[PDB]
Design an enzyme around this catalytic site. Structure first.
Site, PDB file in Angstrom:
ATOM      1  N   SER A  94       3.437  -9.126   8.148  1.00 37.04           N
ATOM      2  CA  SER A  94       1.988  -9.381   8.136  1.00 37.04           C
ATOM      3  C   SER A  94       1.783 -10.869   8.422  1.00 37.04           C
ATOM      4  O   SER A  94       2.133 -11.331   9.543  1.00 37.04           O
ATOM      5  CB  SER A  94       1.382  -8.796   6.887  1.00 37.04           C
ATOM      6  OG  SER A  94      -0.028  -8.905   6.923  1.00 37.04           O
ATOM      7  N   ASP A 215      -1.556   1.837   8.493  1.00 35.41           N
ATOM      8  CA  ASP A 215      -1.776   0.490   7.926  1.00 35.41           C
ATOM      9  C   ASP A 215      -3.250   0.129   8.114  1.00 35.41           C
ATOM     10  O   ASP A 215      -3.645  -0.042   9.315  1.00 35.41           O
ATOM     11  CB  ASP A 215      -0.811  -0.481   8.609  1.00 35.41           C
ATOM     12  CG  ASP A 215      -0.852  -1.903   8.059  1.00 35.41           C
ATOM     13  OD1 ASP A 215      -1.903  -2.260   7.420  1.00 35.41           O
ATOM     14  OD2 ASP A 215       0.157  -2.619   8.176  1.00 35.41           O
ATOM     15  N   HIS A 244       1.317  -0.192   4.776  1.00 42.28           N
ATOM     16  CA  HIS A 244       1.376  -1.627   5.057  1.00 42.28           C
ATOM     17  C   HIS A 244       2.707  -2.216   4.590  1.00 42.28           C
ATOM     18  O   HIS A 244       3.039  -3.291   5.088  1.00 42.28           O
ATOM     19  CB  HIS A 244       0.174  -2.299   4.390  1.00 42.28           C
ATOM     20  CG  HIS A 244       0.120  -3.782   4.554  1.00 42.28           C
ATOM     21  ND1 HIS A 244      -0.021  -4.424   5.762  1.00 42.28           N
ATOM     22  CD2 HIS A 244       0.206  -4.773   3.631  1.00 42.28           C
ATOM     23  CE1 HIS A 244      -0.031  -5.732   5.557  1.00 42.28           C
ATOM     24  NE2 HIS A 244       0.067  -5.954   4.289  1.00 42.28           N
TER      25      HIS A 244
END
Ligand SMILES: [Mg+2]
Length: 264
Positions: A94, A215, A244
């Site tokens: 991320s 996600d 995620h």
């Protein structure tokens, strides 16, 4: 503290290949714990906590310094220079995928390969770009976070994990509850406002894009966008893992894909 002590830098494993595992907002390096068994017998694995991690002294989070991703890139490059392990494979989840992209443009020498999990160069939609979020859409999340942090974490941790994996919900709740809420909010707003689209073409190192499934933060179409726009040799791996945080929720399956994506 030294920078290495402040950001809880750890080097583990016996091998000559260097692997850097870099966590996202809401986690800390312990999010990698169940991946480590797959790499420590043939890598030296570098872990560190982002300054916004709840495991880092909250005194270090200087709102005047950490106003863009570039200040996070400064810390990553300072750690890699201090450890002197040289050319490495970098895995970024991320925000740390974005941090790795930007670090690799400043210092391509340092990176053999980037492995990106949950990567997005921009969350907000733009005229002919799909990030996943319309103007105003995120506002309800930052309102909920500020209004009742504990109710927000209780609803968000299961959504982010995606799959029904209580242990992952436990770990991600723990690292969200360890963060100071004003830091979570500030850093979530900064990252949500990030836009790296205009530098993707300057990447020169190879990249594997491991594209999360269902996600909340990254539409499945993003992988194709990164393959088109990243400037080095890019491969796409559509994960058959939901959510995620695949490194928490399905560490065995995620580790097998990471191993397939290693350079040589
Ligand atoms: Mg190229």
């Amino acid at each position: 503290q030294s920078l290495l002590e402040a950001l809880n830098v750890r080097v583990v494993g016996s091998g000559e290949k260097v692997l850097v595992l870099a966590h996202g907002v809401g986690t800390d390096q312990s999010a990698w714990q169940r991946i480590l068994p797959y790499f420590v017998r043939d890598h030296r694995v570098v872990l560190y906590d982002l300054v916004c991690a709840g495991s880092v002294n909250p005194d270090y989070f200087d709102f005047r310094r950490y106003t863009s991703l570039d200040a996070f890139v400064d810390d990553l490059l300072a750690i890699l220079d201090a450890l002197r392990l040289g050319r490495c494979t970098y895995v970024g989840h991320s925000v740390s995928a974005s941090i790795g992209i930007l670090a690799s443009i400043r210092r391509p020498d340092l990176f053999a390969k980037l492995i990106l999990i949950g990567a997005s160069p921009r969350f907000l939609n733009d005229k002919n770009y799909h990030g996943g979020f319309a103007d105003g859409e995120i506002d309800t999340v930052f309102a909920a976070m500020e209004a009742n942090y504990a109710a927000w974490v209780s609803g968000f941790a299961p959504l982010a994990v995606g799959a029904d994996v209580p242990e992952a919900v436990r770990e991600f709740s723990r690292t969200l509850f360890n963060m100071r809420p004003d830091i979570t909010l500030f850093v979530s707003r900064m990252v949500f406002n990030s836009d790296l689209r205009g530098v993707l073409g300057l990447v020169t190192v190879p990249c594997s894009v491991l594209q999360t499934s269902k996600d909340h933060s990254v539409p499945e179409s993003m992988a194709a966008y990164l393959k088109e726009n990243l400037g080095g040799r890019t491969t796409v791996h559509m994960l058959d893992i939901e959510g995620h945080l695949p490194h928490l929720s399905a560490p065995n399956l995620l580790a097998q894909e990471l191993r397939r994506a290693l350079p040589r």
